[model samples]
Target chain A: MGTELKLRIRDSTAHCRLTKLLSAFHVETQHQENFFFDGANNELSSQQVVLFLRFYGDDTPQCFMSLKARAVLDEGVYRVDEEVEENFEPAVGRACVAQPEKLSSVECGILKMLKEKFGVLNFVGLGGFVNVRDVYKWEGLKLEVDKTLYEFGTNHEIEYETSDPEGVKKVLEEFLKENGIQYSYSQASKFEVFRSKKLPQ
Target chain B: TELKLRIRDSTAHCRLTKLLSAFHVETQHQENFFFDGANNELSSQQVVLFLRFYGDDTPQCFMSLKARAVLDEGVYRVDEEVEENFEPAVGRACVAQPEKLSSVECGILKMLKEKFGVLNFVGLGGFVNVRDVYKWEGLKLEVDKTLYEFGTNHEIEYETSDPEGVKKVLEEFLKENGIQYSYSQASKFEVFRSKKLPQS
Candidate 1:
């Protein structure tokens, strides 16, 4: 078993630096770039969903988590988790000794369990680095700060609302809401998430 | 992509990215200067930088990792003319002179102030060693921007209160030196430890 990217339930608050990028990240990861869906359903609205990272860090004897994210809150976004199943069974003649059991448990069953328990989003990611050492450990996630967030005016499809303009707003808001981040829409269709790096004493 | 790796004190670290005289990035201050692009400088090429930064984590209000680094053959270029804030740049380089303090306290201040310049190993959160407890009387000094390197900025890291013995040493030094100074509790730290290097 490996670490699958689990969509943990999060607060409606996010650090401000990441809010604008979440809208594009959610839609693109699900519908277009990485994971594609079938059907003519309109794109998910920005209004509903949000992303939050509870813990993010590197190394420790005990497994801990440190996460940061951007979330939004708007209308029309539904909280629903859908199950996915893929079947793979290699032929029994690759010359390596193999013992196998075809039994009651399957991928679909797990996906169903996740949908029933976690709701709306599940993920599996296989990238990034984690370090563990003597006095310190750090998981250097490959998520580049600028890349994870949308830069000023690069991707038109991600930056601006294509057909459903309001959907973009809702998506951005969800990321903000999830992380408890605040934002203001700016000129040039810019969405600025505001957060002071200074933690209050 | 020229790959040049180095070993320091028998520890290996990768000089992952280096672009000298690379495409220029105009900072918000609109100062244009030549610098080797860091982290990444391309729209297509893929590379990764491995690093580990350590700090005293306490008194977290300070900018712990605020120093220029040399990645292999790369050197940082500072263009003060184009900066919105020139003071910060100069502050990082010049040592504050507390010449008017008592001999002993002046000794500590001098030691503390010199830690900022031309150092072989001054990392993020390291300390400067103060030598000789007993020396002379109080002293006097002033912060004139002209005292710093021409065209460079000076950043000041000042300590306000000292322990009784040390405080007396420092107060006597400042008083004798005839120096007026500023203090911020947030800026006080015994040491500035540089960010830790990433292990392979």
Candidate 2:
């Protein structure tokens, strides 16, 4: 299993600087815009389940629907994500996969099952965010720093992956203290932030 | 995901792998760690959390906490999998990195810690050198082998998005192979293996 330590960076400037120092170990980067969906009664959200369609690339041609179950841990959200990319087609800007035929047999079945469990059809688009991410690897560890722009607000996240969370925590803390990077332990996920801010109460 | 399938012995695992290869399907090997808590916190409830650390291919590993709701005697509807990359320390009771454990797992861990004091997780049983992964007829298959008293114990698992239709497919596959299986019966290998251990 993959394990990571996520620290919420408050200062945008600090977020930017951390990436620069982190650039020495950088390997890859990605820009992602994820669209979340939920029933009118917040059925899935209440159960800690999130249904999302993620769009990547410049034209957003590569799109996929993912079912994620968010579990809370001491460090960060442990997400189990099941995704289907074969079903969705490319949309102009932002849109949902409305056609049944476009989806594969398995994709269709999963969607149907979720709807039945929730007892609602009103899957409204709850807006999404633009995340400019940079991936860095150091000693077989993955460090992802994200600068996210959302409708409600903006935030920065420095996520570190490792086999030992405590060891990584010490590493991150040392980096932050040495560089004077200000951060805190924010348990809220980006999805949670978007839901509370953008979604109607 | 859900599918109905049968178990073949260690001898049958080779045959099954060969049959699948003939059908142009490739199988992958994996080392699976099924960690059980004291007082059977997970298994007694029919829930299972396993960590998959690769022995072959890339160093990719995943921890999946699955909820298996029993639909019939041997049938189950797997609801959701709370997964993460929580690298668990290898020991008698494998413990995961606390900070990396998913929220669902955190809840279980918290409860276990409070009740049992210090979260005594014992790695009850696991299988090594398992050629466990394959895909046939749109259904994912997993065949596991472990050594027992006399010889080896084997298990066959099939995963599918369409549970109902996969039953027919599984039956057809079995009939073609002249394999006899009970639809309403399943093996409790973990429980059986754990029984052989000294009391916790």
Candidate 3:
């Protein structure tokens, strides 16, 4: 349903420099608390599907669920995601109430897709992490510079959602090279990174 | 299409799971996204229309476009249902965009507008049930765990052609096994509404 190009800034100094560069170009900022879920047997994860709820630092707080199915390199330097998402309200309240099931309407649509595609449902909350992102409109493209904070660690990442893979790769690579930024294509998503880092409990 | 018995006792749940574990148990998580129109059109008139999705080894869906409740209290209950051979498409669209079902050009929606005179519809969310089905005495036994945002429920459903006779046998079996259950004729959607949307 969508394509995105993402990479990690490896050097601490380069990460700082990129943030500084993006500060001037940043259009909006967002803070997110993301929680992932799956069956006791990794039913959702094992299918290259991620079921997560996100609480935004917007309108005090707004919540949404994203069921992102990843297909790697389905595009050139981008990953194709069949992202089925539903936006609702009172996300933070639901989290505090432990009423993930209450958001049935949320995962209702997602469960619809997941149950049909992968034969799995009924998830347990798997903990979460926080991400602060700066949205930047650079050279006619929307890019996001994110600092993800896991309970145990943190990482710096840049993501650009795009339709033209060639333009994104070419433009981002050119910008990185011109600025002497050390980087690598991000192999793991924030969900993977947080989960591997032992989660927030 | 079956009888639903609500079992609140922890003993009954574990016992059912234990006994049914040995049988070839088929498991699936079921959710029905119910709907009503802007003016409480469906619910006001008790027009049952919703989309049901579940999965086992094979995935399937049921969209009740024009539906009505059947008082099928053979002995202890009432209901009827539709099943499939796993191929699905009409529902995938609703699953992808449930709130937008009215806008999609579907045969049922088309019929809904023309036949039933329903010009609009809206999603009323869904109720989730995890079921483990087993073969028992030439009948299908379903151990159901219903999950909600607030709490969980346990039920045992027996699929039979003769509920009157089967009800007595199961009633005696429950007493002998020390399994206490509350009789319920309420459908899953009713339970869902009663718990989640109490005011409605």
Candidate 4:
């Protein structure tokens, strides 16, 4: 588990403004569909685990199964989470995304871990959002700006991960202030937004 | 693959053993786990995939996949087999319960994918057996008793280069004792699949 610092953009043009502002530092970009999974009776929520079936890239995407556990939101800006991940064939991605009923241990490593470690026996699609992420590197640290389209709304968040949360928070705050950007500390994680108004089943 | 026949009498445990008691070399024990996917992918290719736990004292295990079984009057003959022995620790762990199977990046999974694309495997349960093995004039003759959740299969498994000649000799000895037997069909896995519902 590590600390993640985030700020939600409040202006309509904040995303593109930072896009050009940080254009020189841009490293890579990815298109992502971050699907979620959970048991019918809140088994994962009780255990503080979030199962993410992520499809990333375009045309030929990579399927990644990730387990995020024990998430804690601290004062809205900083959060901590433990994560486990593995990748699979795109063919498996097609089958699982197209048919939620087929999301079994056979197709997902996180699901297998869920059964083995936590004893959460069954799971279903919790629905998720699409993320267009622009990644950049500043002073040896990776930062990400994501434009996410959720069922209830669309929003932008700039995030950073660090071991020295206080130091990174200070640096980011100073940078935002110098750039005249208006932002607010994000109140929730992306999955929280997805769960509230998007989960299909 | 070997030639096999069903011993039709309840006295199989006694009669067959006592009959071949002098020729007995050793006893063999086997824990066989047959694997198939939810979609029956392996079986759809006429393939029999299983992991066998066998050996003495320090147990040994190996996985074998044989395809296109050719049967004659209840006897199965697989011309060849794709087999690999697992290292001691991994084999024991797998035999205990293939709990760490998905993480084990190995060749058995590779072969399965090569034979049947996008294949997945789950244990379809398994059976155990105890056999009194005998050496009969260059033949490996086994008087076997196999136990599954469904029922017990009492049979004699024999391997020989010439099946008919050996069959003649074995049957003559059986005929002499008035040891009635029946022809058998289906491999152990076939019996497993049908009897997963319990074979008739």
Candidate 5:
């Protein structure tokens, strides 16, 4: 699993300011869509983790299934995520269905492992957001300024994913402090955000 | 450029081979030769410029020149390879004599000479090996069982753009397997050459 750090951004204006600040550095942007899943008993969330199927595209469509487990470290709340990705054709109207009925071989294998190891499994509906992210590379770490569109209102965040989480965490914290950007530590996972907003199931 | 984590030993070789076989991974064997100048300046400076002749299961043999910058834990490599009908026997003989280098080999030699100054050429001996190369996540792991004329040894290498991340992955894997690995900076050829040296 790879380590990721995330911090809350207040609103659109702050996000825009962060974008301009990142443009002074090196920045690359891409669009991403996340499809979250859970078991019948909401096992994934109850277990303090998330299972998400991601569809990310720039020119061609790509998909991946990932598991992210939450951990409270000395630095802050960090997420350790593992992912397996491959090329996929966009399934038209797939989002209209409440739950995905058919599964790919890889997905079936993963679900089987999860079931045997943990317990029963079920496919939850699409509970995710469309993310437009501006990514920057600084001091060997990736910093992302995200603009997310959920079923309700929009939200913004600054995130960093790296192998050296503690080192990168300090870099991120100092960057924010030096810029005088008012921010808070966000303990809420993306799954919690969708759950609290009562996003369309 | 990439960073590689290397481990040198034999028992770990068998242990890792078994682990990989259980994962249903296949392996291939090849022969590699390293060349240097007579002055040994390149070796002292920890710079590597060598031509590798690969012997496959078939009748084909391919050759390539790989230059590397030696680091504390790994080597950064820039390679230019081509498919050619270079016999392994002739490749071995070339290592004993400072024969005329190929046009490709000469290109690298000239660059080294221009940078390091006029020098005589020498051919260092080579090592033979069977290797299993695997890809997990974005990292590449190569488990090598090296066969020398006198003895044999084993080494494992993990190559990745994120060197720190690759080290963590390998550390985690080794921890799970109850295995301990010591990090070494030397390549197979260096180890073999050092072993072949006469005692003072």
Candidate 6:
């Protein structure tokens, strides 16, 4: 139960009315399908429930959701056991990521909710790689980029591929050397997006 | 040399109270709720794709073929459809049976506060399809439970019933509650009933 729990409003009219009222919060029906691709090139099967809530004075909408959908797999049809364990911080973060053009008032509400409710939303679990340097160098170009930066705050397995992989690699190496950061590259497309935090004890 | 592609991201943390206050605002944490929260994170997520610079077809292509994405897969639809049926009690009763126009407004608010905990329509906004059934050819009478609930709060007393005996009882109730019983503006007495037969 990581800071998120599934909740369902049992009353029927209540659900629909809540849905419509949520529209006042700016949530719209985007689709009736799963928004993900499973490992097997399969579109995840999904049930769509929606409620859009708004910050007191903001036009941006926050989402309240519940669904009875399942992931179809060769092994078996997997249904999610409804649970309520939502993390307000990431919920806000994710919404912000998805809909960046929202009211600051709404964003404020989200941040406020996260802290008071979700325990500071320490999303630092997504590890990162950084450089500690007086100057930045990459791709045969030197950049006067800010010396101080925050990106996940942890070491990550990074990868890249390109027509000039070596050229890019040299630049990255030079930058890391100047900044006192260590790194190695692999042929990969994934980088863990995170920060450091004690695992749920 | 030009880089074919690139990706970037950043994350940061700050104290909640401090951040909010810096912006000249305050928050009231609502931890006490009537229902059991089970103490799960109430955090939710949503996505907004940027398409300003993209070719016109990019969005259409995505929509034509649903994208393989499930960001917050939970929190979705509830299929609720029932055969259209009418209950007599809903629409037959007069909306303003007992009160005058002005008082009805006040009375309706009072009733709502007393019953639904300050403006909760009980999900009527999303899930319910309250259908009312009428009796007379021109007169209005409730014959449904769903509308019965709706009738509990009307814009005015006359909005639901004619200015007569039975309708007067509804108006009288509004008066008892100190709600306005009569009106002068648009007719608030007209109520709708679901046509008993299906529409083609």
lDDT of 2 by residue, A38-84 (tens): 77677878887877766553212355676766546565533344433
| TM-score winner between candidates 3 and 6 | 3
- Please give, for residues B34-137, the per-residue lDDT of candidate 2 as tens digits: 66656677777676766665421223456666665554533557675576664423311242232233233454456545644554455654443234566556
Among incorrect, acceptable, medium and high, the docking class of model 2 is: incorrect
Q: Cα deviation of B105 in candidate 6 (Å)? A: 46
Docking class of 6: incorrect
User: What tens digits encode model 3's per-residue C-alpha lDDT throughout B1-200?
Assistant: 45667775445776767755688457665656676667776577556677766543234666664345653443333243233322245454554455566776656566657755655566676655667788856767887766444334677888766777788888788778777776655666776777642221
Give the winner by TM-score: 3 or 4. 3
- Score residue B179 of candidate 5 by CA lDDT: 52
Per-residue lDDT value at A83 in model 6 = 26
Regions of model 1 farther than 4 Å from truth:
A1-13, A16-163, A187-201, B1-4, B7-200
lDDT-wise, the better of 3 and 5 is 3
> Candidate 6: where is the Cα deviation over 4 Å?
A1-64, A67-79, A85-201, B1-162, B177-200
Lowest lDDT block of 10, candidate 4 chain B: B191-200
Q: What DockQ values do the models have?
A: 0.02, 0.01, 0.03, 0.01, 0.01, 0.01
TM-score of chain A of 4: 0.88
How do the residues B11-63 of candidate 4 rate in per-residue lDDT, one tens digit apiece? 64457677777998876556677777768876777877777765433446788
Candidate 5, CAPRI quality class derived from DockQ: incorrect
lDDT of 5 by residue, B84-199 (tens): 45554444445545455433344455666677876666767565566777765554667765644333455666555677766677778876885556555555666777753112
Q: For model 4, how does the per-residue alpha-carbon lDDT over A56-99 read when each residue is reduced to its tens digit?
A: 64223467888888777675456545788889665565566555
- Pairwise lDDT winner, candidates 1 and 5: 5
lDDT of 5: 0.57
Among residues 3 or more apart in sequence or in different chains, the pairs in candidate 3 whose N, CA or C atoms overlap within 3 Å are: A101-B149, A102-B149, B1-B79, B1-B80, B72-B78, B73-B77
Q: What is the interface RMSD of candidate 6, in Å?
A: 24.5
Which window of ten consecutive residues has the lowest lDDT sum in model 6 chain A? A30-39
Docking class of 4: incorrect
Stretches of model 3 off by over 4 angstroms after superposition: A1-201, B70-93, B103-111, B196-200
TM-score of chain A of each: 0.18, 0.78, 0.83, 0.88, 0.77, 0.21
